[PDB]
Design a protein around this ligand. Structure first.
Ligand code: MG
Ligand code: MG
Ligand code: MG
Ligand code: MG
Ligand code: MG
Ligand code: MG
Ligand code: MG
Ligand code: MG
Ligand code: MG
Ligand code: MG
Ligand code: MG
Ligand code: MG
Ligand code: MG
Ligand code: MG
Ligand code: MG
Ligand code: MG
Ligand code: MG
Ligand code: MG
Ligand code: MG
Ligand code: MG
Ligand code: MG
Ligand code: MG
Ligand code: MG
Ligand code: MG
Ligand code: MG
Ligand code: MG
Ligand code: MG
Ligand code: MG
Ligand code: MG
Ligand code: MG
Ligand code: ZN
Lengths: 105, 159, 117, 293, 202
RNA sequence: GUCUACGGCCAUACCACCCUGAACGCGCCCGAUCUCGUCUGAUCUCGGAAGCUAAGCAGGGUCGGGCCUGGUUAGUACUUGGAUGGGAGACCGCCUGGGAAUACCGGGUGCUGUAGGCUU
RNA sequence: GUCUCCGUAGUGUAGGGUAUCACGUUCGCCUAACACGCGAAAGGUCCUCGGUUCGAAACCGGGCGGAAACA
RNA sequence: GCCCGGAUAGCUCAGCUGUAGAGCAUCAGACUUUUAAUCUGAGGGUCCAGGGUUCAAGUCCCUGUUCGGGCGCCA
RNA sequence: UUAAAUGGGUAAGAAGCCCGGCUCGCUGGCGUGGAGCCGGGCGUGGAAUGCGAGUGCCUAGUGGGCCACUUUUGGUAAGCA
RNA sequence: GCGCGGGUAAACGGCGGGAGUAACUAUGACUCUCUUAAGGUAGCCAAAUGCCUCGUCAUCUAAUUAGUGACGCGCAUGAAU
RNA sequence: CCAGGUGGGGAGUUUGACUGGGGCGGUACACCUGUCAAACGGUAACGCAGGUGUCCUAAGGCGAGCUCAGGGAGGACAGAAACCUCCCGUGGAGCAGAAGGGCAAAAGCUCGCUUGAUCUUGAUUUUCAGUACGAAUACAGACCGUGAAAGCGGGGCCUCACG
RNA sequence: UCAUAGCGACGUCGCUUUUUGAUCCUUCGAUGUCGGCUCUUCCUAUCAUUGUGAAGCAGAAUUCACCAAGCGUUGGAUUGUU
C-alpha cells in the first residue's frame, strides 16, 4: 500500500486535529538490562543448555505495519502509533496514481 | 463441515421479492416505534447496515430502546436446551409493526365498550370467545328438486 | 492502438456556424449525397478527404487529413429528451424519418439524392 | 425479421416499474429520504422542508413535513400572487425569488402567532444573517431547503428564496457559498452584488444597457416591461414597497367561484358492452366489405 | 466396460444434470430423436401411437437408441420408408457416476447418461395413417423388449402429436381457430388484435 | 370535471401506436448582459414572453402486449398421521386430515393525502 | 485398467488470422559426360467427429488410436 | 536480525561525473579453387530499476529488485 | 414466476384499559415530542384442555453407541459408511 | 575456526542429456552444447546383479519357467565401493 | 582460570494429528460462498462446485454530474473489431478477488475537497459453554472531513481476509 | 437361399460364490499360513459311458439339446508353485 508522509489527524496532547508527519516504525534494539533479558541471561548461565523455547515455525508471511506519527506543532511534539493491515509491499509517500493515463505507450 | 458465516444459507432469505427490488419505499421509514410495542423482524436485504442475524428473521419481539436509526428489540431465541431473551439492534427497515397485538387491542377496546354499554341496560352479555360450537340443527329444503344421483366415472387411460 | 491514448478529436457545432460549415461541406460535393448515408433515425452524415481546398488554405506544418460530417436533424421540442427535470420521449409522429430527411434536403438545398442504382 | 426484438413479451413480464414520481422525473428518492426522514427517537417532531420550485412562468415555494399518507403543507407562497401588492412585472427572476421566500416567511410567522417576534431583517442587505432563538419566547422556526433536481451552483434562484426566507425569520442552516456575491477563485463573499441581484440591479443595468443598443431588441425582449411602463429606475422602491407590504399583510385568501357546471371535458371510458359491440360491427363491416368484392 | 443396466435402474440420486459443476460427461448414445417423414404436416398422419411406461425407473441413453432403431427398422419394413413419423419423448439428462477399482473420495466420475420416467410418461411417439394401427401397435411391442421396466401401449385419442382430440380436430381447423404449421398446429385464440383476425377469415 | 407544487401506496400506474384538449397551469419557445457553465447557452445557470399544442403532459381508443384479479386446471399434483395393506421389487391403493401451479377461458386497467389554480 | 503425452507433404518434423524445412520424386542450371552441387516445382482438409467464437490444424468437448508412468 | 560481494550488447567483464569500452558473440564484405585461415565493417547494452551529490554518474550515496555468500537467534 | 402439507415466532389483560396531575439538563415553532413519577376509576378474571408452581446449593456416572418406519448423502451393493 | 585459493579419488562417491554430420536405411568416426566436474574406458552379463522375462538364438530331452554357449541402448554390470 | 571454535567419541530427549487398518496421497486441522439441508434456526462424510493467509491514500469519506452490457441504423481511410452521432436498451455491465445477495439522476463511471482507516467509555450480535479472539451492529463523549443543507462518515456495499 | 440346424449385434432380465474387489461383524491373555503327498465324501453348470430328441444327420465322423453324478476322468519334462 501507499500512504502519504504527512496527514492531519487527532493529536492527543493538544486535543484537536493537527498536521502529523508519518514514518515507518522500527523495533529498537534490546536493552540487555530489562528484567526479562536479565532473567533469561541468568537462566542461560551455567549448564543445562537452552532453557526457553525457540519459535522456529514462522507461519506468517507478512507483518502488521505501524506508522509512527508526530504532530508538527513545535510546542508539543507527541508521537502516536497507528497500525494498518497486513501488506506484502509497503511504500511511504509514493507518487499518486492517475486514472486518465495511457497504460501503456 | 459447513461454515459459520454470518449470512450462510440466506441466498433466498434476504433476497428481495420478485419485481420489488430498488429504492426502499419511504413510508417504512416514517413509521413510529414506541418503547414496549411489538415488532416483527424481516431483514430487508437491500440495506447492509444493522442487519439482524438469520436466526432472528421472522421472529416477533418487543422494543426496549429507540435510537436515531434503529430500535432495540428483546426477542426470545431458543438455543438447543432452552430459550434466552436476547437483545439485538436492528435498523427500522428490517422490522415492521406487528398486527398480532394490534388485533387484540381492537378487541379489548370493542370489548370494554361492550362492558360499559351492558351495565345500564341490565342484561348479561358474552365476553369470552368460544371455539366454534356444533352446527345447530337445521332443515334443508328440496324445493321439489330431487338431489340427483352421483356415480363414479369408469376409469379410462388418458395418458 | 493501445487503450486510453488519444486517437480521435472532434467538436460539436450548432447554429449559424453549423449551417454554413455544412453547406461548405456539400459544396465540395456540389450538393451531392447519393443513396444511403441517411440514417433511419433522421440524421445523416458523410466524409471528405481534402480540407485545404475549402476552407482555410494550406498550412505547411499540418498534413493532409480527411474527416467526416454527421449532422443531426431536430424540431423544437427535441430538447425535452435532454431535460434534467421531467425528462421524456418525443412522441412517435413528432419523430423524424429517413423519408423526410431527403425531402428536407431536396426542399432546402435542392440537392440530388437516390441515383437510380 | 433480422434482428432480435428487445421489448418482447418476456421483457415486460419481468420488467420492474420505478416509483411513479421517479418515472415522471419530479423527485429523487435518494435525497428525499435523507431530507425527509425524522430521527427515530423523536417520534412525531416534524422535519420541516422549505420546498422551492422554479417554473417557466412562476416560482413555487412551500414549507412541508412528510407523513405516511403524504406531505402536509403548512403554508405556501407563490410568485403569481406577488402582483397582488407591489411588484407586477418581473416574475421568475432572482428578485421575485427573494420576495416569495420573504412572503413565505412572513405568512407562516403570522399564521403561527410568531410574527411579532423574530422580525428577521426589515432592512435588506446581502450579508450573512441567520435567526437566533430568544429565551422566554417561542423558539425560532427551523426548516431546511429542498433544492430538488435543480443544479445547486452558485447564483441559483433557489438560493435566493433561501436568503429571502431567512430574512423573514426562518432559521435555515446555510453557508454563504451559493449566493451570487461569492467569488469562487477568491473564496470571498462580496455581499453587495448579492443585494444588487436581490433588488434587481442585475437586470436593471442590463435593461439600462439595452435602450442605447436597440429598441426592437428592447421591445422583443422586455415587452411586458414596456407596458405598465416599468423604467430602469423606480424598480427599487417598488421592491421596497413589495418588501414592506409583505410585512404589513402577508396572509392569503381565496375567490369563492361556485358558478360552474358539470361539463365533463373528457370522455368516460367505454363500457364492456360498447367494446363487444364495436368489434362485432368491425367484424360485420369486414365480412360485408369482402362479400361485395 | 459398461455395467449391467440393473445397477442403475432406479431413480435414487437427486437428478444430476450436465452443468458447469458436472464437466467431463461422455456424449449420450442417442443423438437422433425424430425419424421418418418429419415433413408430414398435420393430416396425412392422424393416428398417434404412444408407448407409456409405468415405473419410476431410469432408461439408459443406450436403451432408447436400441429401442428407436428397432422401431424404425420395422416401420420401413411394413409401413414403408415414407409413411411414418417417430419421436422419442425422452432425453438422457440425468448423469450416472461410477467409482472405479478403498472408499476414499468415493464420489465417482460420470460414465453415462440416463433418462428418468414416471408412471404416466410416454417414451415413444408414432404418428401414422389410420390403417397402419396394427403395424404401430406391434412395432412398439418390439421396442418394448429393449427396456428394463414394464410398458403399456396406448393409442392416443388425440390427432397425431397435437394435444387436441382427433374427433373434434377436423371441425376446429375447419372453423379456422386451429391452423396447421410444420409437424404440428398453431392454436389461434380469439383475443388478439383484429388485424391478426382479419388477415385470415378472408 | 380537472390541473399545478409536494407526496403515500409503487404497472389496475408499464410499453407500443392512434384520436382529442375549453380555461388556468405545466410546457415547448426567444436570448446570453449579469450568475454559472460547457469544445458548443445542446445540457446546466441566468435574463424574458413573439409564437405553438407540433411534442412532453392530461383523457380516451386497441377482439393490443404486459400487469392486477377470478374460473378452469382440480380435490389433480403434493402432503401430516395409520395399518401384520398389495406388490419379488420399483412403487401403488386405502383410512385420517390439509391441499397447489401451468396451458386454456372471463373481468379490470390507477386509487388517494396536504396546499394552491381553472371550469356559469 | 487408470493416468500422462502425442497424431501434420511419400517419410519425418516444427508451428486462431491461409502449414516451415529435410530427405523421397520430378525437374532446370553447371559439365565433353557422369558424379556432386545449386535451384524450383509437386506434395500433408494437420487422426476423426461435435461445439465455441467474424474465422480453429491451433481453443474447448468426444471418439479412435500409439507410446510411455503408474497400477 | 547483522556484515556484506555481484548485477551492464543474446553471454561475461574493465571503465573517466567528461559522449560507454573489450571479448564470446551475429550478419555482411574483402580474403581466398574453397573451407579453414586471415582480417575489417555494420547492427545489437532488459547500463538491475527509482531517486538524490551533483555543471556533470555506469561509477559516488541511499531506496528498493533480484542473485549470491559469512555470522547471530527466549515471543 | 407461482407455491403447498408439515413447521417456527408473537398475542389471547388487573404488570391490562381509561382519566387527570407533576418532573426533565433529552426533543423542540408551540401547551411540541418522549420518558419517568404521582393520585384516581374500572372484575363478565376477557379461548379450549390439563396440571400445584417458583427458586437455590452440592453432585456421581457418561462423553466408543446401535437398530426400526419415514426423509436423505457417498456407494453397483452391502448385516456398508 | 568458517569463507577465499591450491592439492587430493588404491578419500566417500559420480560417470547423464541434447543438437548437426557419411552415396539405400540406420548409425555417427567428426563438430558443438546443457545441467552440478567427467560423461561407463578396458572388460563382463538375463550372472548370486535383467522389471518386461518362461528375453531371443543354438544345444541337451519325446517333452525342459531348469543347465550350458551366444546376443546386449545393461529397469539398475564395471574396474583395490 | 576464563573466552571462541571443533566435537554423534559420549549424554538427554523428540521425531504432530485426521485417516473406510497404517504408510504414501490429501487437509475435510483456522476460515468464507452455493448446495447437501427434508420451505424458522441447527445438522455429518477423505459429500459436490469453488475460494482465503491478500489488495487499496484510494478501490477509504462526503457532494455533484452521468449511465452501464449489448443491439439496430449510420458516417473518409476503417474492415468482424479504432473513432463520432442517433435510437432501443431493468441492468443482460461494473462494484479488487471465490460465490451468493444488493445496487440506476445508485453501491457503478468521471470530477472537487479531504483523512471518520483519528482520540475514548460502556451495551449488543455472531461461534458460544451464551468463555475468549476475530468480525460486526446500534449508541454516547471529543476532534474533524464533506455538502448549500438535511445529513453521511469513526474503513472497503454485506457475507472471510486472522492470533 | 432361410432370424432362430448352429449362431446373436444394439439392448435388457437374472443365477453362482470355484476369481478379484468392497466392508471390518467374529477371533490379536494366538483358530498354525502357499503348494505338494495321502484319504473320504459331496455338487452338477455332463468330458467319457447308459437311454433319448434335433441338424445344413446318406454312411462314418461331428454338433445342439433332455433324464442322468452310478462309474471313470491318467503317465511324465520345466517350475515351490495354484
Ligand atoms: Mg513487561
Ligand atoms: Mg454441507
Ligand atoms: Mg459448505
Ligand atoms: Mg460497512
Ligand atoms: Mg442532491
Ligand atoms: Mg458381469
Ligand atoms: Mg445416493
Ligand atoms: Mg391486453
Ligand atoms: Mg391424502
Ligand atoms: Mg470411553
Ligand atoms: Mg449406519
Ligand atoms: Mg587424478
Ligand atoms: Mg551409495
Ligand atoms: Mg559398455
Ligand atoms: Mg545384461
Ligand atoms: Mg539367476
Ligand atoms: Mg532335470
Ligand atoms: Mg547363460
Ligand atoms: Mg544419540
Ligand atoms: Mg433450514
Ligand atoms: Mg428445518
Ligand atoms: Mg449520486
Ligand atoms: Mg457538518
Ligand atoms: Mg460521534
Ligand atoms: Mg477381518
Ligand atoms: Mg482364543
Ligand atoms: Mg488374532
Ligand atoms: Mg485346531
Ligand atoms: Mg443338473
Ligand atoms: Mg458307485
Ligand atoms: Zn500536538
Amino acid at each position: 500500500v501507499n500512504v502519504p508522509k504527512t496527514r492531519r489527524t487527532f493529536c492527543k496532547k493538544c486535543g484537536k486535529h493537527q498536521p502529523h508527519k508519518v514514518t515507518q516504525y522500527k523495533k529498537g534494539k534490546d536493552s540487555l538490562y530489562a528484567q526479562g533479558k536479565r532473567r533469561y541471561d541468568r537462566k542461560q548461565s551455567g549448564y543445562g543448555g537452552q532453557t526457553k523455547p525457540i519459535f522456529r515455525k514462522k507461519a506468517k508471511t507478512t507483518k502488521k505495519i505501524v506508522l509512527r506519527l508526530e504532530c508538527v506543532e513545535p510546542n508539543c511534539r507527541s508521537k502516536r502509533m497507528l497500525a494498518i493491515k497486513r501488506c506484502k509491499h509497503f511504500e511511504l509517500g509514493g507518487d499518486k496514481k492517475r486514472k486518465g493515463q495511457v497504460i501503456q505507450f | 463441515t459447513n461454515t459459520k458465516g454470518k449470512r450462510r444459507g440466506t441466498r433466498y432469505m434476504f433476497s428481495r421479492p420478485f419485481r420489488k427490488h430498488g429504492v426502499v419505499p419511504l413510508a417504512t421509514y416514517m413509521r413510529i416505534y414506541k418503547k414496549g410495542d411489538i415488532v416483527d423482524i424481516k431483514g430487508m436485504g437491500t440495506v447492509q447496515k444493522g442487519m439482524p442475524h438469520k436466526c432472528y428473521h421472522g421472529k416477533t419481539g418487543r422494543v426496549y430502546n429507540v435510537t436515531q436509526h434503529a430500535v432495540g428489540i428483546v426477542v426470545n431465541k431458543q438455543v438447543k436446551g432452552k430459550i434466552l431473551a436476547k437483545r439485538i439492534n436492528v435498523r427500522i427497515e428490517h422490522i415492521k409493526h406487528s398486527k398480532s397485538r394490534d388485533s387484540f387491542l381492537k378487541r379489548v377496546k370493542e370489548n370494554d365498550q361492550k362492558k360499559k354499554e351492558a351495565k345500564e341496560k341490565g342484561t348479561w352479555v358474552q365476553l369470552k370467545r368460544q371455539p366454534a360450537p356444533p352446527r345447530e340443527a337445521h332443515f334443508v329444503r328440496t324445493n321439489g328438486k330431487e338431489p340427483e344421483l352421483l356415480e363414479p366415472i369408469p376409469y379410462e387411460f388418458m395418458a | 492502438i493501445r487503450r486510453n491514448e488519444k486517437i480521435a478529436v472532434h467538436c460539436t457545432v450548432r447554429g449559424a456556424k453549423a449551417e454554413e460549415i455544412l453547406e461548405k461541406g456539400l459544396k465540395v460535393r456540389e450538393y451531392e449525397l447519393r443513396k444511403n448515408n441517411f440514417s433511419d433515425t433522421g440524421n445523416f452524415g458523410f466524409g471528405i478527404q481534402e480540407h485545404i481546398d475549402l476552407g482555410i488554405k494550406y498550412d505547411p506544418s499540418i498534413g493532409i487529413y480527411g474527416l467526416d460530417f454527421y449532422v443531426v436533424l431536430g424540431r423544437p421540442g427535441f430538447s425535452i429528451a435532454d431535460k434534467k427535470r421531467r425528462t421524456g420521449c418525443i412522441g412517435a409522429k413528432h419523430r423524424i424519418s429517413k423519408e423526410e430527411a431527403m425531402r428536407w434536403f431536396q426542399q432546402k438545398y435542392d440537392g440530388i439524392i437516390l441515383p437510380g442504382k | 425479421g433480422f434482428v432480435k426484438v428487445v421489448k418482447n413479451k418476456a421483457y415486460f413480464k419481468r420488467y420492474q416499474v420505478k416509483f411513479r414520481r421517479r418515472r415522471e422525473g419530479k423527485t429523487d428518492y435518494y435525497a428525499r429520504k435523507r431530507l425527509v426522514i425524522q430521527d427515530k427517537n423523536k417520534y412525531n417532531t416534524p422535519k420541516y422542508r422549505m420546498i422551492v420550485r422554479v417554473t417557466n412562468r412562476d416560482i413555487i415555494c412551500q414549507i412541508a413535513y412528510a407523513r405516511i399518507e403524504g406531505d402536509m403543507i403548512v403554508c405556501a407562497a407563490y410568485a403569481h400572487e406577488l402582483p397582488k401588492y407591489g411588484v407586477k412585472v418581473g416574475l421568475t427572476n432572482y428578485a421575485a425569488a427573494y420576495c416569495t421566500g420573504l412572503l413565505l416567511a412572513r405568512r407562516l410567522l403570522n399564521r403561527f402567532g410568531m410574527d411579532k417576534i423574530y422580525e428577521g431583517q426589515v432592512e435588506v442587505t446581502g450579508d450573512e444573517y441567520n435567526v437566533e432563538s430568544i429565551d422566554g419566547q417561542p423558539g425560532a422556526f427551523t426548516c431546511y431547503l429542498d433544492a430538488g433536481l435543480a443544479r445547486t451552483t452558485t447564483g441559483n434562484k433557489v438560493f435566493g428564496a433561501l436568503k429571502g426566507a431567512v430574512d423573514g425569520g426562518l432559521s435555515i442552516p446555510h453557508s454563504t457559498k451559493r449566493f451570487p456575491g461569492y467569488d469562487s477563485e477568491s473564496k470571498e463573499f462580496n455581499a453587495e452584488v448579492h443585494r444588487k441581484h436581490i433588488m434587481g440591479q442585475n437586470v436593471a443595468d442590463y435593461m439600462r444597457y439595452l435602450m442605447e443598443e436597440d429598441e426592437d431588441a428592447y421591445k422583443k425582449q422586455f415587452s411586458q416591461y414596456i407596458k405598465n411602463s416599468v423604467t430602469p429606475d423606480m424598480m427599487e422602491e417598488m421592491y421596497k414597497k413589495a418588501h414592506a407590504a409583505i410585512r404589513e399583510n402577508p396572509v392569503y385568501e381565496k375567490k369563492p367561484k361556485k358558478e360552474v357546471k358539470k361539463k365533463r371535458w373528457n370522455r368516460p371510458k367505454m363500457s364492456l358492452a360498447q367494446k363487444k359491440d364495436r368489434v362485432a360491427q368491425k367484424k360485420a363491416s369486414f365480412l360485408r366489405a369482402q362479400e361485395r368484392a | 466396460g459398461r455395467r449391467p443396466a440393473r445397477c442403475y435402474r432406479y431413480c435414487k440420486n437427486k437428478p444430476y444434470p450436465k452443468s458447469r459443476f458436472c464437466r467431463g460427461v461422455p456424449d449420450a448414445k442417442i443423438r437422433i430423436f425424430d425419424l421418418g417423414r418429419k415433413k408430414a404436416k398435420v393430416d396425412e398422419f392422424p393416428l398417434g401411437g404412444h408407448m407409456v411406461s409405468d415405473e419410476y425407473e431410469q432408461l439408459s441413453s443406450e436403451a432408447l437408441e436400441a429401442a428407436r432403431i428397432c422401431a424404425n427398422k420395422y416401420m420401413v419394413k411394413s409401413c414403408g420408408r415414407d409413411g411414418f413419423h417417430m419421436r422419442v419423448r425422452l432425453h438422457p439428462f440425468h448423469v450416472i457416476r461410477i467409482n472405479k477399482m478403498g472408499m476414499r473420495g468415493a464420489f465417482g466420475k460420470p460414465q453415462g447418461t440416463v433418462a428418468r420416467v414416471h408412471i404416466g410418461q410416454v417414451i415413444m411417439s408414432i404418428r401414422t395413417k389410420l390403417q397402419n394401427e396394427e403395424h404401430v401397435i406391434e412395432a412398439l411391442r418390439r421396442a418394448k423388449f429393449k427396456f428394463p421396466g414394464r410398458q403399456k401401449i396406448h393409442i392416443s385419442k388425440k390427432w397425431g402429436f397435437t394435444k387436441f382430440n382427433a374427433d373434434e380436430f377436423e371441425d376446429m381447423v375447419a372453423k379456422k381457430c386451429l391452423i396447421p404449421d410444420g409437424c404440428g398446429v398453431k392454436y389461434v385464440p380469439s383475443h388478439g388484435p383484429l388485424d391478426k383476425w382479419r388477415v385470415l377469415h378472408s
